[PDB]
Amino acid sequence: LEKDFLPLYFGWFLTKKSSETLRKAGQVFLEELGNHKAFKKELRHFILELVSYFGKRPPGVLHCTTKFCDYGKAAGAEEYAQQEVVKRSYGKAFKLSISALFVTPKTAGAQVVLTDQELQLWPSDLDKPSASEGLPPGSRAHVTLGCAADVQPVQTDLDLLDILQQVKGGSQGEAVGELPRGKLYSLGKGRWMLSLTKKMEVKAIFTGYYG
Length: 211
Ligand SMILES: [Cl-]
Description:
Elements: E1 9-14, H1 16-35, H2 37-41, H3 50-53, E2 63-68, H4 77-82, H5 84-89, E3 93-103, E4 107-113, H6 116-119, E5 142-147, H7 154-168, E6 177-179, E7 182-188, E8 191-209
Antiparallel strand pairs: 1-2, 1-8, 3-4, 3-8, 4-5, 6-7, 7-8
The protein binds chloride ion.
The site of chloride ion has 6 residues, from loops.
């Protein structure tokens, strides 16, 4: 993991079965959400088949990105990979806990709640936009399940942070309902959160993306 060898990004790449399970949980969520009376009631604030709306799914296995590196050109890439724990974690297996699924007009995603051990692989030099303020590092951690038309998956970061900010300040609101596997919260502005009754555990390998 010297500078010349760095990937486009590092992250946890879900195993094939974990990826399948979470992809399927996400499609069931999008289908059940789009059919729920509370969501249909709020259609104006969002724009319908949410599975298709979020059809942009990059090719390959679902993942939780840590550090965008741009093959060593990105700020802090070399210093991230220089860390012993990164070197020692490359190729190693992890369990990630998913606590919620979410939807915005721009992205559909799974919130990841990293362990202390996994946080050691979370970069310390990320930008700190206003929506991250008061949230501990790693709150951004997610798996993107789908994007709208012309959305860039870097948008998923900011959508999740905005949702977590709203929850943090007590405007989560009362559950509007229950979908399979959790409670459904309406946050306004097209933003929806399925808080899962049980965390979804996925398995993943920490490695580099060289597409
Ligand atoms: Cl964060």
